[PDB]
Amino acid sequence: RRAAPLGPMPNEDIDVSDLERLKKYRSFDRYRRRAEQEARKPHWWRTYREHFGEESGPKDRVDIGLPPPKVSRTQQLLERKQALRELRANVEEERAARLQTARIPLEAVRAEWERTCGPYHKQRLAEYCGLYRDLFHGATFVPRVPLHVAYAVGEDDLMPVYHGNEVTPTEAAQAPEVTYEADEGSLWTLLLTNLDGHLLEPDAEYVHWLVTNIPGNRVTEGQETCPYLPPFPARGSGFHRFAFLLFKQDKRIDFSGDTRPSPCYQLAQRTFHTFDFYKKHQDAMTPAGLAFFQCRWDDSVTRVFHQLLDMREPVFEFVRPPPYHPKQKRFPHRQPLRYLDRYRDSHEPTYGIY
């Protein structure tokens, strides 16, 4: 009983007759490009993307962030081409390019990458690590303003904190310094939170730093709300994610309801909900920057639990599910002698009445 397909068949567009007229592929790298483009379309039949967690497929992402800068494409198109012609005409560049002997100023590219496409590349990094899922749920923001976080480790050594980096707690024992370009006409809010690491509640996150009403670039001159606390990931469960959030606020806002005590060491007072926190001051603040790093356990974590938190250090361990075995039959058929060992409770022999 043949049924009718629910939509167009894949290869029905091409004509079966007159095969020689149709141009062939002639290559294997063309087919891979064609196959991959075909594999991402929403077919009406069952596909791999449907069963293996495509994260609800198309999602209407809510955008809560600064508008993109206004740039004139007409002027930009001409100047970009004009700059390229000057570099193209250089004969010495052709001498190096042909002889396969040339390098590029990676630092110069780093500066320009941040200004041009840095915010968009950092957006998918946060989405990949699920920062938006655990902070604003479905809502997302574009890190428009660049943000730099660095830790003072040695006398002059400076450990940077990029998007998705890895920092040992020893480097993060002291408070970091934040540098960003902003004019003295607005205010900023800095927030450092431990997305995972809350003990009692799994859906809450700790707060390690909170500076309110920062005048321009100078972070120190801003009002301080929650003092810095070194990261304290558990020994068993490693790689906790710590995120720096930068908020741009129009008016001086009364951030007194979230004030924490000065030598704050009660973890029950560090309980935080960024979505709830941003809900109260949604009108005033607006996320503008982002920088997050991974952090695992080290020796410097131990003293935090003992000296600072006055806490016994908890140690976890990765426990796998027990192996699966079938129901034991009274007379196993064509089974090895080790069939009894699978269902043994302990290897110590147990005597009964004897």
Partner: protein, 125 residues
């Protein structure tokens, strides 16, 4: 789980190519005009990408379809992967691309760039 080398790798396939048993895959596409290098998760998403189509890299290179252009793409992507914390990835090149001059020297930039191929073996695979 990915950083602890305990997450599940999508073992299987074998009758198709490339094998999808990885955490991160390096996807290098050589169009006739531009060179694009991608780092992809097994979910299909792209994490970090460095391509000559970017204006940041375009204004520093002479041409976007040279052997030198592949080196610049490799070096820029290697820096970004370190900034993104991705230190291990799997690259499955086409056999003729493995002997190509550009791809051979592109991996040399990755090795000296700090990013190491050959992702670590899963613990209790």
């Amino acid at each position: 789980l990915e950083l602890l080398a305990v997450a599940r790798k999508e073992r299987g396939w074998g009758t198709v190519w490339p094998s999808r048993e990885f955490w991160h895959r390096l996807r290098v596409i050589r169009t006739q005009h531009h060179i694009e290098a991608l780092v992809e998760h097994r979910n299909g998403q792209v994490v970090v990408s460095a391509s000559t189509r970017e204006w940041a890299i375009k204004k520093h290179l002479y041409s976007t379809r040279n052997v030198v252009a592949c080196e610049s793409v490799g070096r820029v992507l290697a820096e970004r992967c370190l900034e993104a914390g991705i230190n291990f990835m799997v690259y499955h090149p086409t056999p003729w691309e493995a002997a190509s001059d550009s791809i051979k020297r592109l991996q040399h930039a990755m090795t000296e760039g700090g990013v190491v191929l050959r992702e670590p073996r899963r613990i209790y695979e």
